[PDB]
Symmetry: D3
Subunit: 304 residues, 6 copies
C-alpha cells in the first residue's frame, strides 16, 4: 500500500487548513478526496524538481462516520481535552486537515486555492495558518527544531500503520495544536535558563548531559520508552507563523505516529505532569489555542 | 548621495508594514530611523549571499511636518482621492511605510519584528501584508507582472530625485494601494477577453499589436508620453497576497517614481478615464481598499538624524 | 537481482535521440560497442556529476536482434506495426539501434553521442538524429505541460520493467518512438479553450477537465486505458520538443516505455483508428508522424556480459 | 545612449540567425526592429533570474542603405574576402544577424520563433546555428575558449563606438564566420603538439611563455599592439555546434569590436601571415564556410524607428 | 533489519580524516563517545540540511576491538599487513579509531570533529589529521578523474556491506586507509601520453584505454581483479586530495571500503608485489605511502546499543 | 583611471593566505612573477566562472619595496609597529610578500597558490600558510557573526583606495595581517551574556548592544573611531577561521585593508594599549597574536607595467 507523503523532504513553507463539513456537504467532500492526488501533481509538476509540493489529507473521528460505512481505523477518536493543574490542552472542531508543504509559499497557496474552490458551499473553515521556517531550522523560541526526528526505516516503523490494523496499513495519525508564545517573558530569560527549559544548548543544538538536564525540560518529558526499553518516536514538522502588528508569535505543532497513544502519552506528561515534574516548562511560555486528531489514510484508500 | 535599495534585485517575498505615529511618539520614531540600516545588516548579513534582505523606509506628508523642522521634498503631499463616475481610489492613513523584501519570508519577518519591537508604544499598525510571488512572475489574475519595468540607467533616471530638488537627491516617491480581486467574475471571462482587459497575451506575455489593443486596456491607459514624446516610466514591484478561507485574493501595488506626478497621471487615466476610454477595465475586477503616498529619503539622510 | 538501464531517469532538460541501421558485416563492431556503452556513459558523465545527470538507454529492434544474438528472443519484440486509419496514418520506418541520451545540458549529450558514433563509424547508417530541449516550465511545443500523469516510484517500476512473465529478460523494457511535426499556424488559430478540449487539461494550470466536460476525442480520454481487471494501464513518456525556425519545423519527439508493447500499441490504435465514440485523437489534426519504430532495451547486465 | 547586450554574462546556449531581406521586405523588417527589445523582455522576464536571455541585432552594409536614410556608421562595409596562399576567408550573403544567448536552448528557440514569425514572407534564411558550450568552457578542440576576453571598463572601451562617430555611439561591429573542423586530424596530434598550435596548455589553460610560444600559434598571431604600444582587443563568444550523423564538428566564431579594422587586422595575420609565420596553424584543422560583417546599433536607435 | 553507517554517501566536496590511538585507561570514555556519535552528527548537521550532507563513519582497529568489547570479533578483522616489495613498501602505522567525516563544506566537518575530540581529550592521542578537498571536475593531484569506476546502487551495497557470511556483524564494512604523497615534479616531466600509460585511461576525457594498448603495469590493469567464478571484485573508494604549497606536499588520501578486506588486500598485493607480467603498479613510482591502517566500521545499531 | 586590485571582492567562503620572504638574489624572479600574476588568476579561474569568484591580492612589505624598486615609495609604507602593552603584545614577524587568495572553493585557491609558488621556487622562503574556511552563517571561531559592519559600495572605495593624498600610488591600499589563536576552553567558561559584553553585540541575533549597556572595553567600542571632522574612520576586513582539531588550534586570521595605515594602527593602539576608560580590548584576554605584518597592495596597472 502506498502512503501519502507523510515522510516528506525538508520544506521551508507550509499551509495548514482545518475545515468542518457542513450538513449536505458529504458528496462534494468525497469527490474532492478522490481527486486530491491528481490536483497535487497538476499544481506541482511544472515546478519540479525544486518545488517539493505535497499534500497530506486527514479525516477526523466524527467525520469518518459521516463519510464512510464499514470499518473504522482502530485508534481514531476525538482529541482528548487535558485539564492540568496549571495548563490546559483544548479540543477544537475539525473534520478535515490539509497539510500542504513546499519550498515556496506560492505553490502551497495555489494548491490550497484549487482544493477550497472544489469544496465551496460544502465546508466551513476553522483554521488557516501560513508557516515559514527560519533559514537555520530554528523556531520562534530561537532553538533548532526537528533535530531528533527519526529518519529512514526507523521513521517508517514509527509513523505507518502496519499489520496491527491491516485494512488501514500505510496510514498514520496526526495531532495538531496551534501555540502562541509569550516572547517578552521568553526573552527575559538568560540563554542558560532557556537551555534548561528545552533540554539542549541553544547555539550548538547539543543535548544537555543526563546530570544537568532537568526532569521538567521539554526533551525529558517527551522522551518515552516502551515496554521493551526501545524509544517510542513521533515525526514532527513544526512551523513558525505570526503577525508583527497583532504581536502574534506562534508554533504550529504537528506530530505523526503509527498510533495516537504515543503522542497522547507525551501530551499527558507535558500538561498533567509526573511524580518528578509538575509540567513541561515550555508551557510557561506557550499557550495551545487549537487541538485536533486526524487519521491520514493510505493514498490508495483515497483513490477509491 | 547613497539611495535606499529602491532598485532591488528580484525577490520572491515581501512584508509591507504601514503604521501611524501616535501623539508623543516622534522621538522614538526618530531614533529608530537612525538605526534602521544597522538593523537591516544585523538581520541580513549572516544570511548572505542568498537572503537578499532590504528595507525601504518611507515617510508621509503629515508625518514629515511632525518629525522634521526644515525643508520639505517638493512633491510630498497626502495621497489624492479620485472619485470617478464608477470607481474610487481611496486615501487611507499612513505615516510610515516599511517595504521589506528578501528571497524568503522568514528574513522579512525577522527584520519586521526588530523594527516593531523598537516602535512599540509609539505607533499604531494600519496594515500588514505578507506577499509571495508566483514562480513564473505571475500575479493573482494569472498574468506576468513586471515585464515592462525599466532596468539599469533608465530605472535610475525614472526613480531617483536629482538636480530638480538637490537637497533630497537620491530619494524617491512611493505610492501604495492594496487591491482585492473578484476572481469568480475574472475566471468567467474567456482567455481572449482577459487579454483585452490587460493588453498582453496571457501565456506568452507578448503585447497586443496597436490595431487590436483596446483603448481601455490596462497597458494602454498606463502608457504615458511626456511633452517631448518620451515615455514616462515608473518602477513597480507588485505582490500577490491572500487568504483562501476568507476568499481574499489580492495584489499589493507599489510604484516608485522620481516625482508623484507621473504615478498620479496614470491613476487619473485609470479611474477618471480619457476621451476614448471611460476607465481601466482592470478596475472592473479590482477594488482599492488603501491608498497612501510616501517619500523615501536617501540613506544618508536617515543616518544623520536625531 | 538484474540491473535495469536508466529508463527511470530524473528530470532532464536536454536529449539526443539517435536511430541507426546496421550495415551488412557491421554486427561484430556493434556487439563490441554494446559491451562498452555503460563504461562510456560513466567516462563522459562522472566528472560532471552531480548536476550533469547524463544517461544513455540503448535499444535493439526485432530484425537486428536475430542478426546479433542466438537463442531466446524477448516475448514482445516485433517490428512496429503500421496503422492505416480513415484520416491519419502511423508510419513504420527503419531502425535497428536506438540511443536515448539525456542530461541537464546538450553538450554532455553531444559528447557521449560523439564517442558512441566514433566506435560505430563504417558499421552503421544514421536514420535519424534529434536534439531536444524542454521548456523551462515543462511545456511542449503546443504550450501544454507535458509529463504530468507519468507514474513514479513503485508504480513506474511495475508499469515499465519486464519481470517474471519473461524471466530471461527481466529488467528490460520496450520503447516506441515517433517523430511528430506540428502545424503551429493552425494550432495558434484555436482559442485557449478549444486547445484545452483537444488535450483534455487546462493550459495554464494543468488541471484535468472534469469527466462531464472532457471530450471523448481529447488526447487524455483516448490515451486513458483500463485492463481486463479494470486497473489503469500506464506508460512512462519523456517527450521532447525539437525544431528549426528557418525551415519552419516545429516538432515533438515521442518516446514511451512500457513492460509490454501491447499497452502502447492499444493507445496508438485508439488514437489513429478511433473508438465507437471518437473517430480519432484530435491532437492528430495538428500533428503528423514521420517516423515510427519499436525497440527492446535490455537489462544493463545483459549488455555488459556479451 | 543605451547599448544592446553586447557585454553579456557567460551563457551556455546560443542561436545564430542570418537572413537576407527579400524584395519589398523593408517595411516588415523596420517594424520588427522597433519591437525586438520588447520581444526579448516578453520571452525572458518570466524566466529570470536564471534564463539570462538576450538578443543582439546586427545590420549589414547593403541592408543599411535599403532600410535607413541619412548617416551611415563610418566603418560599415561588406565583409572583405581574403584569398591567402593556402587558406581563404570567404564572404557569404547576410543582411540581418540575430545573436541570441541564454542559459538554456529552449529560451533562445522561443525568441527566435517570435522574431521569425514576424519576418515570414519578408526574409530568406541563410544560416541557422544552435550552439552549446562545454561545461568547463571548452570548445570543440578541447581547449578553454574565452580566457583573455576583456572585462569591465576595458571591454567597454574595446567594443563600444564612442566620440569618433558620435551619431552611432553605443553601437559595435560584429564579424561572424562558421568554421568546420577536421577532428580526425586534430586528435592524431599529441597534446603537446596541440598546445603549440593554440599557444596555451590544454589542461591548465596557462599561456606558453614568449620563448616557447611558436610564431604561427593562434595566440601569437591574434595578439596585436596599436600605434601607441597598447593591446588591441576584441570580445569573442565562440560556440561549438554540430551533428554526429553528418560528422559535422564546428566552431561558430563571433567577434565584437569598436571598429572593424581591429578584427580585420587579426584576420589578415591569420590568413595571409607575417614575416615569420605563413599562417595561423589553427587553420590547418579549421575551414571557414561563411563570413559576414554587421553593425549592431545602440538599443535606443532601434526603439526610435 | 540492521542500519549501516553512511558508507554509501552522496558525493561530497570536503572531508576530514582523523586517526587516533586509545591511551591506557581511555576505554570507558571511548565507549561513551561511540554511543553518542550519531547524536552528535545530527546536532551539528541538522540545521544545515538538506545541502550540508554531513556524515561520520566510525571505524575500530583490530587490537582496539579486543580492548573495547568482549565476545564475537568480525571475521575479517586483523591489523593492516605490511607489504615489503622489491622496490615499493606499504607501511603499517598505528591507529585504533577512524573518523571519516564528509560534507559539502569543510566548516561542518570541522565542527563535528571539534565536538568528537572535545569528548575524547585525555583518552586518545592523535596520529593523523587530513583536511581534503575535491577539484571541481573530480580530479586528483595527478590531474586524472578519480572515482569513475566506483560501483553504484545495488552493486555498491553488495560489494561493501557485510551480509549472511558473518550475520552478527551484518551491515558493517572494512576500511583501508593509506596517505600518499606524490612527486609532482617527476610526474609533470612526463608527456600526457606517458601519464595515460601509467594510469590506463585518457587524461582529458577519462575514456579507458583499449585492452590491446593498456599496459599490464598500469594502475587500472593491476587493480582490476576477477574472482574464482570470473566475476569482477569491486571496492568503493572516496579518495581526497590534500596538501600544503609552502612545504611542497601534494597528496592523495586513499580510503577503500569493502565487504571483506581480502579484496582490498589482493589489489594491494598486485600493486606492491607485482604479477608474472608486471613488476609493480607504475603509479607507485610517483606516489609514496606514509600511513597504512585497517578498520571495521560497524552497523549504526551496534554503536548505539553500547 | 588606475585599476585597483580586487580588494573589494564579493563574499567568499574559502581563502589561502601565503606570506613569504625574498631570498638574497631572488628579486628578478619576483619581479617577473608580479607582472604575470593577473594572467595566472584568469588562467586558473576562467573555466570555473561565474561561481568560482577566484581573486588574488598581492602585497609588498616596506623592506622588500626598497629591494625591488627604485624611486618614490608610497607615503605610509613602513614595517609593522610592535605594540608592547601592560598585558598584551602585538608582535612583528617577517614578511616581504603577501598573496591573499579568495574563492568560493578551496581547490581554486590551492591551484592558483601552486602556480604562484611554482614560479618562485628557489627565490623565496615560506613564513606562513593558512587555509581558511567560513562557517555557514558567517560566524568566527568565537561563535559571533564576523563582518557585519564592514563598509560597502562607494563608502568602501573611499575607506580603502589611495587617492589624491598620494597620487603616484592612487588605486593601491594597505593591508595589515595578524594570525590570532584563541583559548576556547577559557572562552567557553563565560556565559553567553558575558561573551556579549566582550564583543559588544548579541550573539545569536548580531544586534549591537545599546550605548547604555555597551562596555567601554568591548571590541566594538574600542574599534569604533571618529576623525577630527566627526566622520567614521573605517576599514574593510575579511577575517577567516582556521585550525587543527588534533593540536587544539582554533584561530582567526585577521586582515584589514585601509587607504592609510594610520586608521588601522589607531585601532590597534586602542586595543593593545588602551584608552582613558579602558585598559585594553577584552577580546585579547581570549586571543593571542602570533604574527604581524604590513603590506602595500599596488594598483593592478603598476604590477602589469613591470
Ligand atoms: C510549543 C510547542 C513546541 C515547541 C516550540 C517545541 C520545540 C522543540 C524543540 C526546540 C525540540 C528540540 C529539538 C528537536 O529534537 O526537535 C523539541 C523536541 C521534541 N518535541 Fe517539541 N516543541 C513543541 C511542542 C511539542 C509537543 C506538543 C510535543 C508532543 C506531543 C512535542 C514533542 C517533541 C519531541 C518528541 C521531541 C524530541 C525529544 C527527544 O527525544 O529528544 N513537542 N521540541
Ligand atoms: C490590481 C492592480 C494591478 C494589477 C494586477 C496590475 C497588473 C499589471 C500587469 C499584468 C501588467 C503587464 C506586465 C507588465 O509590464 O508589468 C501591468 C503593467 C503596468 N501597470 Fe499595472 N497592475 C495594477 C495596478 C496598477 C496601478 C495602480 C498602476 C499605476 C498607478 C499600474 C501601472 C502599470 C504600468 C505602468 C504598467 C506597464 C505599462 C507599459 O508601459 O507597458 N498598475 N500591470
Ligand atoms: C504529438 C505528440 C504528443 C504530444 C504533444 C503529447 C502531449 C501530451 C500532453 C500535453 C499530455 C497531458 C499531460 C501529461 O500527462 O503528460 C499528454 C498525456 C498523455 N499522452 Fe501524450 N502527447 C503526444 C503523443 C502521445 C502518444 C503517441 C501517446 C501514446 C502512444 C501519448 C500518450 C499519452 C498518455 C498516456 C498520456 C497520459 C493520459 C492520462 O493518463 O492522463 N501521447 N500528452
Ligand atoms: C577557428 C576557430 C577559432 C577557434 C576554435 C579559436 C579558439 C581560441 C582559443 C582556444 C583561444 C585561447 C583562449 C582564449 O583566450 O580565448 C583563442 C584566443 C583568441 N582568439 Fe581564437 N579561435 C578561433 C578563431 C578566431 C578568430 C577568427 C579570431 C580573430 C579574428 C580569433 C581571435 C582570438 C583572440 C584575439 C584571442 C585572444 C588572444 C590573446 O590575447 O591572447 N580567433 N582562440
Ligand atoms: C596514489 C594513490 C592513488 C591514486 C592517485 C589513484 C587514482 C586512480 C585513478 C585516477 C583511477 C582511475 C579512474 C577511477 O577512479 O575509476 C583509479 C582507479 C582505481 N583505483 Fe586507484 N589510486 C590510488 C590508489 C589505489 C589503491 C591503493 C587501490 C586499492 C587498494 C586503488 C584501487 C583502484 C581501483 C579498484 C580502481 C578502479 C579500476 C577499475 O576497475 O577500473 N587505487 N585510481
Amino acid at each position: 500500500p502506498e502512503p501519502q507523503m507523510v515522510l516528506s523532504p525538508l520544506t521551508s513553507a507550509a499551509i495548514f487548513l482545518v475545515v468542518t463539513i457542513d450538513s449536505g456537504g458529504e458528496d462534494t467532500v468525497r469527490d474532492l478526496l478522490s481527486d486530491v492526488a491528481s490536483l497535487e501533481r497538476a499544481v506541482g509538476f511544472r515546478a519540479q524538481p525544486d518545488g517539493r509540493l505535497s499534500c497530506v489529507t486527514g479525516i477526523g473521528s466524527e467525520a469518518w462516520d459521516r463519510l464512510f460505512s464499514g470499518a473504522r481505523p482502530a485508534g481514531l477518536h476525538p482529541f482528548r481535552e487535558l485539564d492540568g493543574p496549571v495548563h490546559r490542552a483544548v479540543a477544537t472542531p475539525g473534520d478535515l486537515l490539509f497539510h500542504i508543504r513546499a519550498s515556496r509559499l506560492d505553490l502551497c497557496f495555489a494548491l490550497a486555492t484549487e482544493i477550497m474552490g472544489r469544496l465551496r458551499g460544502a465546508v466551513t473553515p476553522q483554521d488557516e495558518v501560513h508557516g515559514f521556517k527560519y533559514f537555520d531550522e530554528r523556531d520562534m523560541l530561537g532553538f533548532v527544531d526537528g533535530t531528533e526526528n527519526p529518519t529512514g526505516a526507523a521513521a517508517r516503523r514509527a509513523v505507518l500503520v502496519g499489520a496491527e490494523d491491516p485494512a488501514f496499513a500505510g496510514g498514520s495519525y496526526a495531532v495538531v495544536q496551534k501555540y502562541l508564545h509569550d516572547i517578552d517573558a521568553w526573552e527575559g530569560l538568560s540563554v542558560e535558563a532557556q537551555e534548561r527549559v528545552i533540554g539542549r544548548r541553544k547555539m550548538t543544538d547539543v543535548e544537555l548531559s543526563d546530570d544537568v538536564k532537568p526532569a521538567d525540560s521539554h526533551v525529558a518529558l517527551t522522551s518515552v520508552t516502551g515496554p521493551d526499553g526501545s524509544d517510542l518516536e513521533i515525526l514532527r514538522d513544526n512551523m513558525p507563523f505570526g503577525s508583527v502588528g497583532r504581536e502574534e508569535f506562534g508554533t504550529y505543532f504537528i506530530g505523526y505516529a503509527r498510533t495516537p497513544e504515543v503522542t497522547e502519552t507525551m501530551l499527558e506528561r507535558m500538561f498533567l505532569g509526573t511524580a518528578s515534574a509538575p509540567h513541561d516548562r515550555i508551557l510557561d511560555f506557550s499557550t495551545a489555542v487549537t487541538g485536533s486528531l486526524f487519521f491520514t489514510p493510505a493514498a490508495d484508500f483515497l483513490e477509491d
